[PDB]
Curated annotation (Swiss-Prot):
Protein name as catalogued: Apolipophorin-3
Source organism of this protein record: Manduca sexta
Domain of life of the source: Eukaryota
SUBUNIT field: Equilibrium between a soluble monomer and a bound lipoprotein form. Apolipophorin-3 associates with lipophorin during lipid loading until each particle contains 9 or 14 molecules of apolipophorin-3.
Tissues of expression: Hemolymph.
Amino acid sequence: DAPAGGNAFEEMEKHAKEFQKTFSEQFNSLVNSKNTQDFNKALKDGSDSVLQQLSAFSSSLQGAISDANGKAKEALEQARQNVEKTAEELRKAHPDVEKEANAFKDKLQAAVQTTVQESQKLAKEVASNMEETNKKLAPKIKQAYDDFVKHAEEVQKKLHEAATKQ
């Protein structure tokens, strides 16, 4: 068997998690910034950006809850807002990291590492495969899959140029 089902979408948490260690390694480059009470603000622009960027896939599951056929529309509703708040969690601030500029960057790095723990709950949830009808969530889990590798490094892209501006 193979061309019918059984592939399981658990690999989504594997490729997504592996992509979480890529941004955690770049954030270390941010430390290489200036120091005049005006070097962290730019760090919040690149970090607060990955929040709305990675928080975008969260809306990809809504398609399954927008018309799910079972008790999954709810489980898929949490992974959506649950993973959307973990990233946008620090998106509620902005003037604080630039004001204290103490350790506001770790807020995002620690917020992304969690987005991976969420893929574990949704990975085992759809892993059951005991729905036998919720095939609409199939194309809903592969949505974040591509949004995880693209958003995960979303911060490593700016963070890198953030430690050297320009």
